[PDB]
From TrEMBL, chains A, B, C:
Component of the RNA degradosome, which is a multiprotein complex involved in RNA processing and mRNA degradation. Its cofactor is Mg(2+). This is Polyribonucleotide nucleotidyltransferase. Its main location: cytoplasm. The chain holds residues 2 to 564 of 697 of the full protein. Belongs to the polyribonucleotide nucleotidyltransferase family.
Length: 543, 543, 543
C-alpha cells in the first residue's frame, strides 16, 4: 500500500470512535474521524512561519456539512452548497473558541481548520465529532498548540446527565450543553437550559470535563503513533527597557481619548515594540487594580451592576418594543408577530426544519462610536443572537397555545459590555409588551474573573475594557426559577469547581437585581396582543 | 434619570415633528425624529481626525427600513433584511447629495450616516423624515458641516403645490418633487412630473425651499439646546509657490493623454501638494475660459448641443432597439415586452409592490475607455436609471390600454456627459420601435452653470470635463408639452430664481433641438408590436 | 455621418459573418460581429502602460448574454442579469485560454475583454462569434498581441465533420469540439465525444484549424482597413549577470521547501530581477533534464504513470463513493441519486433548461497544503468540473432507462497534477458504487509536451511542476472503446499532426493502464442502487 495509515479506536460513552490519518489529504494535517453515524474530515494547515508584520494570531475555522453526506442533493441554488449556513457558522465558532487561547502568546503563524461532514446517518449532531477531529488534527500538526482538547455534549434526562445524546434523546432533555477542555481545565461552555439551578449547571460542566478525558488520552496516543513530537518553538523576547490616572476616567469615550493620546505621547518619545509594550502596560495596570481591591475603572466594586433604565412601548408600530440600558450598553429590541407564511425554514442533514421563533442581532459600528463597512451578518453577530435566543427559549409559550410566528430583533444602539445579555432582557421586555405570554421574565448578566496565583476576583456586569483583560468571561441568563443559558470562555489554569461555584452565585444576585428592575416596568405579558398584530380567527374572509 | 434628553417639537405643514437626542445611541451623534406616522433613528459618526494620506472626503450614508417598523417579518431570505434594496439605495442618495457639498474643501475626516426607519404606519414615504434627521444629527456632531439643511416633498394637486404629501395625496398629484436646501440656497432637486411647464417646475422648487425654512430654524434651536457650538476647524494652507493649450484639444481621449502627460512633466519638475495644486490649475483654467466668453473645450458656444445621430431597429431580435449618440455619449437602449409573469415585484413597508415598468442602467468601464472590476449595480447606476425612468414615466401607456410588462435596458457604450439623458432619448426611441404607443416622445439634456460673483454662464449639453467644474449641474427631460423629470445639484450661493429661470429656458431649447432630431427618424410608435414579441390573444392553447 | 464605419463581410461555412467598428463604443477597441442569428459586441481596453510593480499579465475576459438579445425579461432577481452564470463563465474561459499565451513574455499591461451578446435567434451557441469578435477587437487595439486567432466548433454527423453546427445539428452529433488557433498553430481544444477514436479526434482538430483560416484572413483584412499597424513594443532586457540537486527530491512538500530555501539564499546573496531570474533558472533546469533523457523530478521516465490506489464505498451514507489516488493527486468523489425535484434548472437564451446530471468540483487550499480565503466556485473550478463532466457524459445511462437525478461531487483532497482527470476516474468509480449502470468505465490522464527545435518529449501523468514548464498540456478521458473528452492548450509553434498523433497514442496507453487498475476493484455497476437511495416505485403512499 502507498499509504502509511495510523488508526486509533476507542469507545466514547455510547459511541465507537475511530481516528485515522495517512490515507486522505496527506498534504495537510488531516484526520478522518467516525463517531457513531457521523464521519468528519478535518484538515489543518499551519503556515511554517509568521508573516512579516503580523501582530495578531490569524486563525480561521470553516465547518461544512455536505448534503451528499446524507444522500441529499442541495436545494435550489444551482444545487450547490453555497455559503456557510447559520448553523454551520455556529459550529465553526464552537471549534474556534476553545482552540484559539491554546496557542501561546506571540504565535502569529496562520492556521486554517477545514472540517467537512462527509457522512451522517442523521441521528445526532456532528459538532462533537468535528471538535474531536480538530483536536486530533492539531495534535499531529507540529505547532505549539497546547492540546489536545476534548469535547462533549451533556444533556439532562430524568434528573441524570447524559453524555453525547442523539436527536431522539435530546427531545426529552432539559439541557443542551457543550463543553470543551484540556486534560486539566474547562475552556468553553455553550448551553441552553430549562430553568436549571446553578448547582445543576455546574455539575453538567464537570460531568462533561470528566467524561471527555478518555477521548483526550486517545488523541494523545493517536498523535504519538502518528509520530507527533513536542514543539521546539520558543516565543521571542521583548525589549526589556502614573498609568492608573487615565483608567479613573469613567466615561468610555473620554477614557479612550485620554488613553489614545497617551499612546501618541509614547510613540513620539520612544514601532511594533512600542505598540506591543504599550498595550501590556495597560493590561498589567487594570488587572492589579482589581486584584488589589481598588475601585474599578468606573468606580464600582466587584459586585455592583451598572445603572439601569427600562422602557417598553417605545415604537408606535412595532408589535412589541423595549429600550434596555445598562450603563453604556443599550439594546432596542422588538417583537413581531406573524402567520405560518413567516416561519423560518432551513435545510439540515435531517430534513427541512421549520422554526416558529427567530432572533436576529445587529451590532452597527455607531454603537461604539465608530465607522464600519456594510456587510452581512457576522460570525459574532450570529453567535450573540443565538446565545440570547438560548436565554429566551425555555420561557416561550408552546406553539399550540400561542400559534404565532415570533421574530425578535435586537438592535445594539450602544455597546460597552455584553450587548448579548442586554438583548436577553430587551427580548423578555418586548415579548411581554407584544402580549406574548411568557412562563417567566428572563434577564442576563456578563461576568468576568481575574486570577493571579491564589488571588482572584469575580466581576459583575463587566465593562468593555474588563472583557479584554479577564482570564475567564462568562454569561448567565435566566428567570427567577433558574438558568436558561450559560456561556463560558476560560483562558487559564486552576479555576476550580469551588471557584466557579462562587462566580455563578455572584452572577445569580446580579441577574436577580436586573430582573427586579425590569419587573417595576412590566412583569407579565399584556392581556392582549398588539392592536397592529394580525388576528387569529376561526373564520377569515378574503375579499 | 440617567439620560439628559433634549426635545424639540414643531409643526411642519400638516405633520407634527419631534426631534430627540440624549436617550438612544449616546455613543454617536444620534437623533430620533418622528414625523407623522414615521419614526427614524439617524446616527452620525465623525472621525476626530483625517487619515494620514486621505485626499478626498470619505462620506457614506446607509439608509434602511426595518420590516419590524410596520409589524412585518422580512420575506424568504432567512427572514433577514439582507442588502439594501434599490428603493433604500435611492433614499441614501437623496440624503448624501445635499450634505456632501456642505463640508468645506479640504475636510477629509470620515463621516458615516446610519438612518434606520424604526416605525411607520405606512401612510407616507420616510425619506423627508430621514433627511431632517440627518440634518439634525449633523447639527450636533461638532463638524464644520455648513448646515442645517431642510427637506420637503412638493406635489401638485388641483393646480396647487402641496407640502409633504402622503401616499393617498400622491395618487392625485401631477408632481413628485423632493428638494433640499439650506437657509439661503437650494441644493438638490429630484423630481418626476406629468409634462409640467418650466414655470410650474421652478415654482415647486421655490415653494419647497420656502416651506422648509420652519424646519431649518427648528433644527437650529434644537442643536443649540443640545449644546452644539461653532466649529473651530480651519482649512490648512497650501504651498504658495500656457495652460489653455491642452484644453483646446477636442477629442476626449487625446485631451486627457495630453493633460496626463503634462502632469508627469510637472511631477518630474517639482507629492500630494503637486497633485492638489495641479488639479486646481486645470480647474481655474477651464472656468475662466467659459466666463470670459471663449469657446468651450470642444469649440462650442454656451448654447450649442453636440452633433447627434439617431438609429432605431439596430438589433435584429430585440423587441425594440435604438442607438442614440450625442457627441461622445452613446446609449444602446432596448425595450422588451413580457406577460404578467415578468413583472417586477418588490417588498415595501406598505406591502408587496408589482410594477409593470422597469428601467435598468449599465455603465461599463469600457464606455470611458477604462478597465474596471466586475460587480453588481452601483449606487450611481441605480440613481441614473431611476432618473431616466422618471423622464419616461408620464408618457407610458396605461396598463389597461397596453397590457404588457415593459423592461428597458440602457447600455452606455460611450460616456462624455450625462449618459442618463442619452438613456431617456434612447428609451423613447426604442419604445416606439417596439410599437409601444407613447403619449409623446421625450428627450433629455444635461446642463451646467458656472458663476463668479455676478458673472455667470449656462452651459448646454455639458462635457464630462464641464461636469467636474460646474457650480450647478441640472438635468431636464420632457416632451414638447412639458417637463417629465428635473434633477439639480447646486454647490454655491446666490443662484436666484431669475437665474434658474434663464437656465431652464436655455435647457428647453436644447431638449427641443434633440427631440426634433429624434423625430426625423421616428415620431410615433410602429403600428404593430415586434413580430418577436409574445402576442396577447383572447384564446391561447397550450400543447 | 459622424461615424467612420469599417465593415468586413465574408462567408464562414454556412453562416454570413459581418465585422463592424467605428459606430458603437468608439472609446474602446470595439467590434460588433454578426454570425448567422447571433450578434455580439466585443470591447477591448488596453492600458497604455504597465503598472509600477506589475510582474504578471493582468487579463480578464467577461462574457455576458443579455436576456433582451432574445426578447426575454430576466427571471426573478429584481429582473436583473446578476452575476455570470456558469455557462457564461465557461465561455469566458473559452475566449481567455487561446488569447492569453499570445501576448509576449514581459507584457504586463492590463487588458479587459467585454463580450456581450446583444441579439440571438436561439438557433446556435454564441461562443464562436464571441471568440471571433474578441480576435477582431484585439487586432485593432494596437497591442503586441500575436493574432489574429480563429475559432470553430466541429461536430460529427454521419461520420463527417461539420463546421459550426447549430443546436438542431448538434442533436445528431457524436462530437462537440471547439478549437482556436492562429494562422500557423492550434492553441486550444475543448471537446466532448461519444467514445471516438484518437484518429477521429485529431482529424476534428485539424478540420477546424483548416476551416477557420478564411476567418483569420478576413480579420486580417478588416484590421488593415481599420488602420491597424504593427506593434513597436519591445520587451525590456534583463540583468545579464548545481540547480539539478533540488529537483531530485521526489516528495513535493520537501522539494518546494528546499527550493524556497534556495530562493531565500539567493535573495540574501544578490529585488524583482532576482525573482524573475530565479524562476527562469528553475524553468531552464527542469526542461533540459526532460529533453536530455534524464529521469523526471520523481524518478519516472516519460511514459510511466504514478502509483495508483482505488477504493470504493469509503463513505457509509453516500449513495456511491470512491477514493482515487494517483501519486499525490487525490479525489474523494461521491454520487447522489434524487427525484425530479432535485434536477438542475438554468435559464438560457433558448429557454429554461432542465439537466438530470450535474458534476460539482471543489478545490480547497488544504489540497496543496495551503491556506486560502473562503469564496464561491472559481472560474477554474467551474472549468475543471465541466471537463470531468464531459469525460463522463457519453457513458451515462439514458434517463428513460435510469430515471434518477444524478449529482456527482469531486472533493480534491490532494493535488499534484490534474485533479480533473482524477475526478473523471472517481466519478466513474462512484457511479458504479451507487449502482448507476454505465455503458463502460472511463478514466482520464493529463499529459505534457516539452519541445525545443526538433527535440521533443511527451510526458505521461504530469506533475504539478511539469504543468508549469510544458509547452503543450493536454488531457484525454475515455473508455476502452474511445475518447469521451479531449482538452488541449498549446503555447508554441510547430506541433505537427504527426507529433500530436504520437502524443495521443502515448495518452491512450496511460488511460488504459489507469482503467485496468480501476477494474481490479469494480468493473460494473452494483446490481442494486444504494440501500439509502430513494426508491422508484409504481405505487407510492404519503402518510
Amino acid at each position: 500500500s502507498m499509504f502509511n495509515i495510523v488508526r486509533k479506536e476507542f469507545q466514547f460513552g455510547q459511541h465507537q470512535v475511530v481516528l485515522e490519518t495517512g490515507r486522505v489529504a496527506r498534504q495537510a494535517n488531516t484526520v478522518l474521524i467516525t463517531m457513531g453515524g457521523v464521519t468528519v474530515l478535518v484538515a489543518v494547515v499551519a503556515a511554517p512561519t509568521a508573516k512579516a508584520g503580523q501582530d495578531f494570531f490569524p486563525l480561521t475555522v470553516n465547518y461544512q456539512e455536505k448534503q451528499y453526506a446524507a444522500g441529499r442533493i442541495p436545494g435550489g441554488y444551482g444545487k450547490r452548497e453555497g455559503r456557510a449556513s447559520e448553523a454551520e457558522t455556529l459550529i465553526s465558532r464552537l471549534i474556534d473558541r476553545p482552540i484559539r487561547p491554546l496557542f501561546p502568546e506571540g504565535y502569529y503563524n496562520e492556521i486554517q481548520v477545514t472540517a467537512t461532514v462527509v457522512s451522517s446517518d442523521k441521528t445526532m449532531e456532528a459538532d462533537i465529532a468535528a471538535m474531536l477531529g480538530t483536536s486530533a488534527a492539531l495534535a499531529i500538526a507540529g505547532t505549539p498548540f497546547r492540546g489536545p482538547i476534548g469535547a462533549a455534549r451533556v444533556g439532562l434526562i430524568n434528573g441524570e446527565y447524559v453524555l453525547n445524546p442523539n436527536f431522539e434523546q435530546m427531545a426529552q432533555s432539559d439541557l443542551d450543553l457543550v463543553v470543551a477542555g484540556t486534560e486539566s481545565a474547562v475552556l468553553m461552555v455553550e448551553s441552553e437550559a430549562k430553568e436549571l439551578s446553578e448547582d445543576q449547571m455546574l455539575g453538567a460542566v464537570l460531568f462533561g470535563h470528566d467524561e471527555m478525558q478518555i477521548a483526550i488520552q486517545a488523541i494523545n496516543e493517536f498523535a504519538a503513533a502518528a509520530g507527533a513530537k513536542p514543539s521546539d518553538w520558543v516565543a521571542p523576547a521583548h525589549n526589556e527597557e502614573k498609568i492608573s490616572e487615565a483608567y479613573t476616567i469613567a466615561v468610555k469615550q473620554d477614557r479612550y481619548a485620554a488613553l489614545d493620546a497617551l499612546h501618541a505621547e509614547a510613540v513620539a518619545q520612544f514601532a511594533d515594540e512600542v505598540d506591543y509594550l504599550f498595550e501590556d502596560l495597560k493590561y498589567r495596570t487594570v488587572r492589579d487594580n482589581i486584584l488589589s481591591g481598588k475601585p474599578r475603572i468606573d468606580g464600582r466594586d466587584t459586585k455592583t451592576v451598572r445603572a439601569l433604565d427600562v422602557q417598553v412601548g417605545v415604537l408606535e408600530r412595532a408589535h412589541g418594543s423595549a429600550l434596555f440600558t445598562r450603563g453604556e450598553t443599550q439594546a432596542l429590541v422588538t417583537t413581531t408577530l406573524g402567520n405560518t407564511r413567516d416561519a423560518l425554514m432551513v435545510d439540515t442533514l435531517a430534513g427541512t426544519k421549520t422554526d416558529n421563533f427567530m432572533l436576529h442581532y445587529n451590532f452597527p459600528a455607531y454603537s461604539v462610536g465608530e465607522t464600519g463597512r456594510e456587510s452581512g451578518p457576522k460570525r459574532r453577530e450570529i453567535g450573540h443572537g443565538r446565545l440570547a435566543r438560548r436565554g429566551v427559549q425555555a420561557v416561550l409559550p408552546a406553539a399550540d397555545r400561542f400559534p404565532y410566528v415570533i421574530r425578535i430583533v435586537s438592535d445594539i444602539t450602544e455597546s460597552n459590555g455584553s450587548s448579548s445579555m442586554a438583548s436577553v432582557c430587551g427580548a423578555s421586555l418586548s415579548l411581554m409588551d407584544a402580549g406574548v405570554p411568557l412562563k417567566a421574565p428572563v434577564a442576563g448578566i456578563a461576568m468576568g474573573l481575574v486570577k493571579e496565583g491564589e488571588r482572584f476576583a469575580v466581576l459583575s456586569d463587566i465593562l468593555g475594557d474588563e472583557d479584554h483583560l479577564g482570564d475567564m468571561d462568562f454569561k448567565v441568563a435566566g428567570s427567577a426559577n433558574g438558568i436558561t443559558a450559560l456561556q463560558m470562555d476560560i483562558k487559564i489554569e486552576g479555576i476550580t469547581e469551588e471557584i466557579m461555584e462562587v462566580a455563578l452565585n455572584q452572577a445569580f444576585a446580579g441577574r436577580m437585581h436586573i430582573l427586579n428592575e425590569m419587573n417595576k416596568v412590566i412583569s407579565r405579558a399584556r392581556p392582549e396582543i398588539s392592536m397592529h398584530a394580525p388576528t387569529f380567527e376561526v373564520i377569515t374572509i378574503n375579499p
